[PDB]
Amino acid sequence: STAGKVIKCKAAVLWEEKKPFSIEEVEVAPPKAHEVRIKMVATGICRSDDHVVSGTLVTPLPVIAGHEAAGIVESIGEGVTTVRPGDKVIPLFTPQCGKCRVCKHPEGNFCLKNDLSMPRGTMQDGTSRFTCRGKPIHHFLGTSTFSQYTVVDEISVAKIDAASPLEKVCLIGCGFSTGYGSAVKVAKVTQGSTCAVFGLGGVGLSVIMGCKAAGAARIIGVDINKDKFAKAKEVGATECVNPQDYKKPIQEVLTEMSNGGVDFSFEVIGRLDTMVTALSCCQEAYGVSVIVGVPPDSQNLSMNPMLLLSGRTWKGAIFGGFKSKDSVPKLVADFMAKKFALDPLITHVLPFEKINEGFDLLRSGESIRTILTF
């Protein structure tokens, strides 16, 4: 009954930088060929949406942010074959065109048809499917999840298990997959190993879960916030050290505990200094260090190349290294299996009209994760 025409719903529009979201009434055009229209059930509030707000992550304004969510398909345009109206889904911030140099590469996952490198804030056709009173509103990463309805290209959507709690699995859209995959697919943690995770936030907790799934024998969780240590242990950290309690550099305290250094270290905070530190606390001969995120406004770090000469590996990734369309479905399946748990991460569920409030919880504080329900 909306199957073939415009929709009128409320979306959180960012007109200007450093301005709160504006609950507005916008019209959502019907999906063109290979586009899919989804009715949002829940969306998480991720750090990267706040960067849009600061002007740190530069993308065309006004826009409709959000990228970590789950929904239900309302209508699909011409040529769509992967989803059907009524199907559960998760929109993908990192596409899967399935045909670029990267999609075909057995390891690569940063699909070339992504809108994060040189942001356009459009659909693959270069047009916006949103208007606010005659004014065109830009998309955010082919997602725009801070809307009751959104349109996404077919390469930016994944069909998941129909019995999926969408108020929980929305995590698989960013936060969880990003940390989880960093462990299991980027570092490729091995059983019996020792790992160090710098930052015990939500992505942080997801890395620990990965390291655990992977089979690590020890997981040192490091944060300067004692308070964050309980969940970490509950989720899998075997130990937790507060760099603030030692009279010496933790790379040292860390190299001493692991007797030589850890097998894998994770810098999940995005700090430059911490990036180097984690590189160092790693076994000099065969240690692997993974950078989970770096603020979009990061500067150059200072390092001694000698750190790599001994035998260390330094890696990075977007979306936990997962081939998005192939993998999302699988993470739900594993969750449905009772494999991993997602609850420990959800610290707040607010109705969607209270967005800006969610952002406050995020901005100055302890909010592991805030889920917005529609």
Sign for the CA dihedral angle at 28, 30, 34, 40 comes to positive
CA-to-CA distance for 134 and 21, rounded, in angstroms?
19
If one asks whether residue 215 binds its own copies (CB under 8 A), the answer comes out as: no
Smallest separation, CB 103 to its own copies (Å): 10
Gap between the Cα atoms of 310 and 57, Å rounded:
36
CB 343 within 8 A of CB 169: no
Tell me if 104 contacts its own copies by CB under 8 A: no
Q: Which residues contact 217 (CB under 8 A, 6 or more apart)?
A: 191, 192, 193, 194
- Taking CB under 8 A as the rule, does residue 23 contact its own copies? no
Instruction: Choose the stretch contacting Zn ion; rule: CB under 5 A; options: 168-176, 200-208, 268-276, 332-340.
Output: 168-176
Would you count residue 47 as binding its own copies (CB under 8 A)? no
* Set 1, 9, 54, 67: catalytic member: 67
Report the SS3 class of residue 192. Answer: coil
- For its own copies, give the closer residue by CB, 23 or 272: 272
285: contact with its own copies by CB under 8 A: yes
Nearest to 264 by CA among 192, 317, 320: 192
Complex with Zn ion: residue 38 or 111, whichever CB lies closer: 111
- Cβ neighbours of residue 179 closer than 8 Å, sequence gap 6 or more: 202, 203, 204, 205, 206, 207, 208, 209, 210, 266, 268, 292, 320
Q: Which two tokens stand for residue 78?
A: 């011409």
Q: Is 193 exposed, middle or buried (0-12, 13-18, 19+ CB in 10 A)?
A: buried
Residue 48 annotated in active site: yes
Question: x/- contact string, 292-321, with its own copies (CB under 8 A)?
Answer: -xx---xxxxxxxxxxxxxxxxxxxxx--x
Q: Please state whether the peptide bond connecting residue 91 to the residue before it is cis, i.e. omega within 30 degrees of 0.
A: no
Q: Is 118 in the site for its own copies (CB under 8 A)?
A: no
In whole angstroms, how close is the CB of 237 to its own copies at the nearest point?
Answer: 23
The reply on whether position 107 binds its own copies by CB under 8 A is: yes
Known catalytic residue at 22: no
Q: 92: closest CA among 137, 5, 156?
A: 156
The binding site for an alcohol comprises: 48, 67
Asked if 286 touches its own copies (CB under 8 A), the answer is yes
For residues 230 to 269, the per-residue mask of contacts with its own copies, x marking binding by CB under 8 A and - elsewhere, is ------------------------------x---------
Amino acid at site 47: R
Residue closer to Zn ion, measured from CB, 16 or 326: 326
46 is catalytic: yes
Footprint on this chain of its own copies (rule: CB under 8 A): 101-102, 105, 107-110, 112, 260, 272, 275, 283-286, 291, 293-294, 298-318, 321
Task: Give the catalytic positions in this structure.
Answer: 46, 48, 51, 67, 174
